[PDB]
Short mmCIF file of all heavy atoms in Angstrom, two decimals:
data_model
loop_
_atom_site.label_atom_id
_atom_site.label_comp_id
_atom_site.label_asym_id
_atom_site.label_seq_id
_atom_site.Cartn_x
_atom_site.Cartn_y
_atom_site.Cartn_z
N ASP B 111 188.33 -35.64 -5.27
CA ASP B 111 188.25 -35.44 -3.82
C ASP B 111 187.44 -34.20 -3.47
O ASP B 111 186.64 -34.22 -2.52
CB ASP B 111 189.65 -35.33 -3.22
CG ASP B 111 190.40 -36.63 -3.23
OD1 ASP B 111 189.76 -37.71 -3.19
OD2 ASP B 111 191.66 -36.58 -3.26
N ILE B 112 187.65 -33.11 -4.20
CA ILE B 112 186.95 -31.87 -3.90
C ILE B 112 185.48 -31.99 -4.26
O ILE B 112 184.60 -31.54 -3.52
CB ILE B 112 187.63 -30.71 -4.64
CG1 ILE B 112 189.05 -30.54 -4.11
CG2 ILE B 112 186.83 -29.43 -4.49
CD1 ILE B 112 189.87 -29.66 -4.95
N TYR B 113 185.20 -32.61 -5.41
CA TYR B 113 183.83 -32.87 -5.83
C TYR B 113 183.06 -33.68 -4.79
O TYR B 113 181.89 -33.39 -4.51
CB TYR B 113 183.88 -33.61 -7.16
CG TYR B 113 182.56 -34.02 -7.75
CD1 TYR B 113 181.67 -33.07 -8.25
CD2 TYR B 113 182.22 -35.36 -7.85
CE1 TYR B 113 180.47 -33.46 -8.82
CE2 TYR B 113 181.03 -35.75 -8.42
CZ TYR B 113 180.16 -34.80 -8.91
OH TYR B 113 178.97 -35.20 -9.47
N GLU B 114 183.71 -34.67 -4.18
CA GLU B 114 183.05 -35.58 -3.25
C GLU B 114 183.03 -35.07 -1.82
O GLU B 114 182.39 -35.70 -0.97
CB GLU B 114 183.73 -36.95 -3.28
CG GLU B 114 183.49 -37.74 -4.57
CD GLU B 114 184.24 -39.06 -4.59
OE1 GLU B 114 185.15 -39.25 -3.75
OE2 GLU B 114 183.91 -39.92 -5.44
N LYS B 115 183.69 -33.95 -1.52
CA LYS B 115 183.78 -33.47 -0.15
C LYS B 115 182.42 -32.99 0.34
O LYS B 115 181.82 -32.09 -0.25
CB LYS B 115 184.81 -32.34 -0.06
CG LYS B 115 185.04 -31.82 1.36
CD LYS B 115 185.52 -32.94 2.29
CE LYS B 115 185.84 -32.40 3.68
NZ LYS B 115 186.34 -33.47 4.58
N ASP B 116 181.94 -33.57 1.44
CA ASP B 116 180.65 -33.24 2.04
C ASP B 116 180.89 -32.58 3.39
O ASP B 116 181.29 -33.24 4.35
CB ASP B 116 179.80 -34.50 2.21
CG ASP B 116 179.57 -35.24 0.91
OD1 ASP B 116 179.25 -34.59 -0.11
OD2 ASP B 116 179.72 -36.47 0.91
N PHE B 117 180.62 -31.27 3.48
CA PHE B 117 180.80 -30.57 4.74
C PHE B 117 179.58 -30.75 5.63
O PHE B 117 178.44 -30.81 5.16
CB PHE B 117 181.03 -29.07 4.52
CG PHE B 117 182.28 -28.75 3.75
CD1 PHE B 117 182.21 -28.15 2.51
CD2 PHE B 117 183.52 -29.03 4.29
CE1 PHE B 117 183.35 -27.85 1.80
CE2 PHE B 117 184.68 -28.73 3.59
CZ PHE B 117 184.59 -28.14 2.34
N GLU B 118 179.83 -30.82 6.93
CA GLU B 118 178.74 -30.86 7.90
C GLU B 118 178.05 -29.51 7.93
O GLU B 118 178.70 -28.46 7.89
CB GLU B 118 179.29 -31.24 9.27
CG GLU B 118 178.67 -30.54 10.45
CD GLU B 118 179.37 -30.91 11.77
OE1 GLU B 118 179.08 -32.01 12.31
OE2 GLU B 118 180.20 -30.11 12.23
N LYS B 119 176.72 -29.53 7.94
CA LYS B 119 175.93 -28.32 8.11
C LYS B 119 175.71 -28.10 9.60
O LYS B 119 175.14 -28.95 10.29
CB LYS B 119 174.60 -28.43 7.35
CG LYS B 119 174.79 -28.58 5.84
CD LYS B 119 173.47 -28.73 5.10
CE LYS B 119 172.91 -30.14 5.23
NZ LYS B 119 173.72 -31.13 4.47
N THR B 120 176.20 -26.97 10.11
CA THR B 120 176.13 -26.68 11.54
C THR B 120 174.95 -25.77 11.86
O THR B 120 174.58 -24.91 11.06
CB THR B 120 177.44 -26.03 12.02
OG1 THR B 120 177.34 -25.76 13.43
CG2 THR B 120 177.71 -24.73 11.28
N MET B 121 174.35 -25.99 13.03
CA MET B 121 173.33 -25.08 13.55
C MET B 121 173.93 -23.86 14.23
O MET B 121 173.19 -22.94 14.58
CB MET B 121 172.41 -25.81 14.53
CG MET B 121 171.51 -26.83 13.83
SD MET B 121 170.34 -26.06 12.69
CE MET B 121 169.25 -25.28 13.84
N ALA B 122 175.24 -23.85 14.43
CA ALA B 122 175.93 -22.67 14.92
C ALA B 122 176.32 -21.77 13.75
O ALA B 122 176.10 -22.10 12.58
CB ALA B 122 177.16 -23.06 15.74
N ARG B 123 176.92 -20.63 14.06
CA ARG B 123 177.40 -19.71 13.04
C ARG B 123 178.35 -20.43 12.09
O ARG B 123 179.29 -21.10 12.52
CB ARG B 123 178.10 -18.53 13.72
CG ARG B 123 178.31 -17.30 12.86
CD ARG B 123 178.57 -16.09 13.75
NE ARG B 123 179.05 -14.95 12.99
CZ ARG B 123 180.33 -14.72 12.72
NH1 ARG B 123 181.27 -15.54 13.14
NH2 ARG B 123 180.66 -13.65 12.01
N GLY B 124 178.10 -20.30 10.79
CA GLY B 124 178.87 -21.02 9.79
C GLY B 124 179.00 -20.31 8.46
O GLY B 124 178.56 -19.16 8.33
N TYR B 125 179.60 -20.97 7.47
CA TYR B 125 179.84 -20.39 6.16
C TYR B 125 178.65 -20.61 5.25
O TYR B 125 178.09 -21.71 5.20
CB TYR B 125 181.07 -21.01 5.51
CG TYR B 125 182.41 -20.61 6.08
CD1 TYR B 125 183.48 -21.48 6.03
CD2 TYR B 125 182.62 -19.34 6.62
CE1 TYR B 125 184.72 -21.13 6.52
CE2 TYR B 125 183.86 -18.98 7.12
CZ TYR B 125 184.90 -19.88 7.06
OH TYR B 125 186.14 -19.54 7.54
N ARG B 126 178.29 -19.57 4.48
CA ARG B 126 177.18 -19.72 3.54
C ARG B 126 177.46 -20.85 2.54
O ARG B 126 178.46 -20.82 1.82
CB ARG B 126 176.90 -18.42 2.78
CG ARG B 126 175.91 -18.57 1.59
CD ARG B 126 174.46 -18.87 2.01
NE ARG B 126 174.38 -20.05 2.87
CZ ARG B 126 173.30 -20.76 3.13
NH1 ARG B 126 172.16 -20.52 2.51
NH2 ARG B 126 173.36 -21.72 4.05
N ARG B 127 176.52 -21.80 2.48
CA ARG B 127 176.70 -22.99 1.66
C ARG B 127 176.94 -22.64 0.19
O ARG B 127 177.93 -23.08 -0.40
CB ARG B 127 175.49 -23.91 1.79
CG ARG B 127 175.21 -24.40 3.20
CD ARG B 127 174.25 -25.60 3.19
NE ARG B 127 172.97 -25.34 2.54
CZ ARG B 127 171.81 -25.22 3.18
NH1 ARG B 127 171.74 -25.23 4.50
NH2 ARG B 127 170.69 -25.08 2.47
N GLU B 128 176.04 -21.84 -0.41
CA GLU B 128 176.16 -21.57 -1.85
C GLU B 128 177.48 -20.90 -2.20
O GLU B 128 178.04 -21.15 -3.28
CB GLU B 128 175.01 -20.69 -2.33
CG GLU B 128 173.63 -21.33 -2.27
CD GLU B 128 172.95 -21.14 -0.93
OE1 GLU B 128 173.64 -21.20 0.11
OE2 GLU B 128 171.72 -20.92 -0.92
N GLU B 129 178.01 -20.05 -1.31
CA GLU B 129 179.26 -19.37 -1.61
C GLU B 129 180.44 -20.33 -1.55
O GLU B 129 181.34 -20.27 -2.40
CB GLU B 129 179.48 -18.18 -0.67
CG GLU B 129 180.66 -17.30 -1.10
CD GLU B 129 181.03 -16.24 -0.08
OE1 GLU B 129 180.21 -15.94 0.81
OE2 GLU B 129 182.16 -15.71 -0.17
N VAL B 130 180.47 -21.20 -0.53
CA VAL B 130 181.50 -22.22 -0.44
C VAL B 130 181.44 -23.16 -1.64
O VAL B 130 182.47 -23.48 -2.25
CB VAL B 130 181.37 -23.00 0.88
CG1 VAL B 130 182.27 -24.22 0.89
CG2 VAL B 130 181.69 -22.09 2.07
N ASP B 131 180.23 -23.61 -2.00
CA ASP B 131 180.07 -24.53 -3.12
C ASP B 131 180.54 -23.91 -4.43
O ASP B 131 181.22 -24.57 -5.22
CB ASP B 131 178.61 -24.96 -3.23
CG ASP B 131 178.21 -25.97 -2.17
OD1 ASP B 131 179.11 -26.49 -1.47
OD2 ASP B 131 177.00 -26.23 -2.03
N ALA B 132 180.18 -22.65 -4.67
CA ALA B 132 180.61 -21.99 -5.90
C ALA B 132 182.12 -21.83 -5.96
O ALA B 132 182.73 -22.00 -7.02
CB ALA B 132 179.93 -20.63 -6.02
N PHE B 133 182.74 -21.51 -4.82
CA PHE B 133 184.19 -21.39 -4.74
C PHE B 133 184.85 -22.73 -5.04
O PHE B 133 185.80 -22.80 -5.84
CB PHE B 133 184.59 -20.87 -3.36
CG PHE B 133 186.03 -20.49 -3.24
CD1 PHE B 133 186.55 -19.46 -4.01
CD2 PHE B 133 186.86 -21.13 -2.33
CE1 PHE B 133 187.88 -19.10 -3.90
CE2 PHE B 133 188.19 -20.76 -2.22
CZ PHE B 133 188.70 -19.75 -3.00
N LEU B 134 184.35 -23.81 -4.44
CA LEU B 134 184.91 -25.12 -4.72
C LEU B 134 184.71 -25.53 -6.17
O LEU B 134 185.54 -26.26 -6.73
CB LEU B 134 184.30 -26.17 -3.79
CG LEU B 134 184.62 -26.06 -2.30
CD1 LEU B 134 184.10 -27.29 -1.57
CD2 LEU B 134 186.11 -25.87 -2.06
N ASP B 135 183.62 -25.08 -6.80
CA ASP B 135 183.43 -25.36 -8.22
C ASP B 135 184.58 -24.80 -9.06
O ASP B 135 185.05 -25.45 -9.99
CB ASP B 135 182.10 -24.80 -8.71
CG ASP B 135 180.91 -25.67 -8.33
OD1 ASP B 135 181.11 -26.88 -8.06
OD2 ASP B 135 179.78 -25.15 -8.31
N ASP B 136 185.03 -23.58 -8.74
CA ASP B 136 186.18 -23.02 -9.44
C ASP B 136 187.44 -23.81 -9.15
O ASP B 136 188.27 -24.02 -10.05
CB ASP B 136 186.38 -21.55 -9.06
CG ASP B 136 185.47 -20.62 -9.83
OD1 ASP B 136 185.05 -20.99 -10.95
OD2 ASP B 136 185.18 -19.52 -9.33
N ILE B 137 187.61 -24.25 -7.90
CA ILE B 137 188.81 -25.00 -7.53
C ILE B 137 188.85 -26.34 -8.25
O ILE B 137 189.92 -26.81 -8.66
CB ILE B 137 188.87 -25.16 -6.00
CG1 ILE B 137 189.21 -23.81 -5.34
CG2 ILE B 137 189.91 -26.20 -5.60
CD1 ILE B 137 188.97 -23.81 -3.86
N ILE B 138 187.68 -26.97 -8.43
CA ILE B 138 187.61 -28.22 -9.18
C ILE B 138 188.17 -28.03 -10.58
O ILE B 138 188.97 -28.84 -11.07
CB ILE B 138 186.16 -28.74 -9.23
CG1 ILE B 138 185.73 -29.27 -7.87
CG2 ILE B 138 186.01 -29.81 -10.32
CD1 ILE B 138 184.27 -29.67 -7.81
N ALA B 139 187.75 -26.95 -11.25
CA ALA B 139 188.24 -26.68 -12.60
C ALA B 139 189.75 -26.53 -12.61
O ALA B 139 190.42 -27.05 -13.51
CB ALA B 139 187.56 -25.44 -13.16
N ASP B 140 190.31 -25.84 -11.62
CA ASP B 140 191.76 -25.70 -11.54
C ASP B 140 192.43 -27.05 -11.32
O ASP B 140 193.48 -27.32 -11.92
CB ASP B 140 192.15 -24.72 -10.44
CG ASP B 140 192.20 -23.27 -10.92
OD1 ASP B 140 192.07 -23.05 -12.14
OD2 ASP B 140 192.38 -22.36 -10.07
N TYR B 141 191.86 -27.91 -10.48
CA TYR B 141 192.47 -29.22 -10.29
C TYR B 141 192.43 -30.05 -11.56
O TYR B 141 193.34 -30.85 -11.81
CB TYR B 141 191.78 -29.97 -9.14
CG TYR B 141 192.41 -29.72 -7.79
CD1 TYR B 141 192.22 -28.52 -7.13
CD2 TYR B 141 193.19 -30.69 -7.17
CE1 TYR B 141 192.77 -28.29 -5.89
CE2 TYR B 141 193.76 -30.47 -5.93
CZ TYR B 141 193.54 -29.26 -5.29
OH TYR B 141 194.09 -29.03 -4.06
N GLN B 142 191.39 -29.89 -12.38
CA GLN B 142 191.39 -30.52 -13.70
C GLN B 142 192.59 -30.05 -14.51
O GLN B 142 193.24 -30.85 -15.19
CB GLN B 142 190.10 -30.20 -14.45
CG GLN B 142 188.84 -30.73 -13.78
CD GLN B 142 188.54 -32.18 -14.13
OE1 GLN B 142 189.42 -32.91 -14.59
NE2 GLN B 142 187.29 -32.59 -13.94
N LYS B 143 192.90 -28.75 -14.44
CA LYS B 143 194.05 -28.21 -15.17
C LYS B 143 195.36 -28.74 -14.60
O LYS B 143 196.30 -29.00 -15.35
CB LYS B 143 194.02 -26.68 -15.13
CG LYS B 143 193.11 -25.99 -16.16
CD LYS B 143 191.77 -26.68 -16.30
CE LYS B 143 190.58 -25.73 -16.37
NZ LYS B 143 189.30 -26.50 -16.25
N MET B 144 195.43 -28.91 -13.28
CA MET B 144 196.64 -29.45 -12.65
C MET B 144 196.94 -30.85 -13.14
O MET B 144 198.11 -31.21 -13.33
CB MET B 144 196.48 -29.46 -11.13
CG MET B 144 196.30 -28.10 -10.50
SD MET B 144 196.00 -28.28 -8.73
CE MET B 144 195.59 -26.59 -8.31
#
Side-chain angles (χ1 to χ4, degrees):
Chain B
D111 289 332
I112 296 167
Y113 178 70
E114 290 177 345
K115 184 59 177 182
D116 303 314
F117 297 116
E118 142 185 281
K119 298 178 282 290
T120 180
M121 291 295 289
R123 198 161 168 272
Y125 287 151
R126 170 69 305 198
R127 300 196 303 251
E128 294 88 322
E129 189 189 342
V130 170
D131 285 349
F133 190 62
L134 294 189
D135 281 338
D136 278 334
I137 288 167
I138 288 174
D140 272 353
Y141 270 75
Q142 297 276 19
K143 278 42 137 191
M144 298 175 188

